[PDB]
Amino acid sequence: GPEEEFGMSLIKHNSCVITTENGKFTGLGVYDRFVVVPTHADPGKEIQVDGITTKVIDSYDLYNKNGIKLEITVLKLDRNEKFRDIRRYIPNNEDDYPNCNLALLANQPEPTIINVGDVVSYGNILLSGNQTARMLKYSYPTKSGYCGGVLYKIGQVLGIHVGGNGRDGFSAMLLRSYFT
Numbered sequence: 049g050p051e052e053e054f055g056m057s058l059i060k061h062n063s064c065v066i067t068t069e070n071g072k073f074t075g076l077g078v079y080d081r082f083v084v085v086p087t088h089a090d091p092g093k094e095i096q097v098d099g100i101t102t103k104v105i106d107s108y109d110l111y112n113k114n115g116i117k118l119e120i121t122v123l124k125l126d127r128n129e130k131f132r133d134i135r136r137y138i139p140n141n142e143d144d145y146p147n148c149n150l151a152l153l154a155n156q157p158e159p160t161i162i163n164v165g166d167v168v169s170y171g172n173i174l175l176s177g178n179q180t181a182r183m184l185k186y187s188y189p190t191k192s193g194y195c196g197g198v199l200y201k202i203g204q205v206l207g208i209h210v211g212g213n214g215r216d217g218f219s220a221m222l223l224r225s226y227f228t
């Protein structure tokens with residue numbers, strides 16, 4: 049089945065467990081030594097990538113035009129390994145996406161693929177009191193430990209999981225123009 053194989057491939061080549069003072073998160077390698085984590089992962093001067101202490105050269109928290117956070121932080125890692133370029137899989141615009149999946153690595157016994165169903169561009173939400181913009185919503189009972197999880201569909205890297213309430217799950221949207 050090509051979409052599930054695409055999912056495991058994306059974890060093999062583009063996923064990693066980013067560890068910070070806040071705990072372990074699924075990091076998504078986007079291109080060269082750039083990786084994204086939830087902004088609430090709160091990455092310091094050094095983070096652990098798959099257990100290896102790594103220095104982060106620069107840390108860029110992503111915000112929309114009106115100053116609201118996107119809950120995406122772009123990390124530029126000090127390390128030899130280069131990530132495969134998945135940018136061509138990233139959407140240029142906001143949209144809705146039926147039958148999506150979530151690729152989990154951190155806090156999981158092993159790389160796990162969860163089907164969260166239909167996804168909708170849901171607008172701004174309040175995560176633990178904090179306004180957050182460009183939210184993809186889905187009706188799936190996502191749990192603690194899922195943050196950083198890569199929302200995807202065959203040939204499509206849609207977003208990274210950042211929150212939920214036992215009922216629904218929310219992902220920070222990935223847009224191509226952010227990785228330019």
Ligand SMILES: *[C@@H](CC(=O)OCC)[C@H](C[C@@H]1CCNC1=O)NC(=O)[C@@H](CC(=O)[C@@H](NC(=O)c1cc(C)on1)C(C)C)Cc1ccc(F)cc1
Pocket residue numbers: 070071072073088119173174175176177178180189190191192193194195196210211212213214216217218
């Ligand atoms: C993922 C965090 C993680 O894995 O960290 C590893 C150390 C986690 C996923 C949720 C836990 C419960 N269900 C989940 O899917 N994210 C968080 O815990 C963030 C906080 C929340 O998600 C809160 N939820 C809401 O605020 C909320 C709002 C709506 C419309 O639906 N749910 C609950 C835990 C109360 C952590 C976080 C993220 C972003 C922030 F700006 C602040 C805090």
